């Protein structure tokens with residue numbers, strides 16, 4: 001049902017440094033997940049040019065940001081390309097490996113954490129604000145999958161037999177107790193305007209009631 005896997009040692013190291021380093025500019029995680037979402041949105045927009053059948057699983061290309069005070073989650077939804085089980089288990093780790101090691105070196109050298117994006121590993125910035133990250137994803141040529149990790153060296157991958165999303169990805173951030181500021185409407189807006197005002201898809205913030 002659920003499979004557990006170790007992260008690439010370097011991604012594990014990176015994650016450990018994200019959690020155990022005193023860094024007050026935690027807001028960067030949102031620019032990174034939106035930029036990832038945008039990248040994944042570009043991929044499907046492009047694949048669809050060659051083959052328009054790739055939008056049968058959803059024609060709209062957008063990012064939604066959903067804060068939820070009750071569950072204390074900030075969910076970043078996108079209708080991008082989404083991930084295969086292969087991407088979740090093998091590809092993502094392998095493609096992050098070199099960027100992770102460069103980032104590790106940059107940090108020891110003196111580089112700021114905000115620099116993580118430039119090494120293609122901005123996703124793991126989620127762990128500055130999240131105690132657990134749950135990613136639901138669905139790619140046209142694969143089933144829906146739930147990827148979950150609270151760091152500590154491992155992640156789990158399972159078929160998500162919940163509500164089907166069509167195509168795309170939800171990164172569900174189980175925010176730390178001290179990091180609920182990212183659930184505030186005015187705060188999400190501030191970060192989006194300041195960091196990623198140049199994303200070529202509509203970013204809708206869902207107002208909680």
Ligand SMILES: CN1CCN(S(=O)(=O)c2ccccc2-c2ccc3nc(N)nc(C(=O)N4Cc5ccccc5C4)c3c2)CC1
Pocket residue numbers: 033035036037039040041043078080081082083087091092120121123135147169171
């Ligand atoms: C810098 N990144 C370069 C690569 N991509 S990509 O081109 O889309 C891509 C190319 C190959 C294989 C897959 C993807 C792909 C597709 C859709 C994606 N959608 C979202 N929302 N996020 C990501 C993402 O980067 N991560 C990182 C990560 C790490 C652990 C667990 C989960 C995740 C999710 C996505 C990645 C995203 C931008």
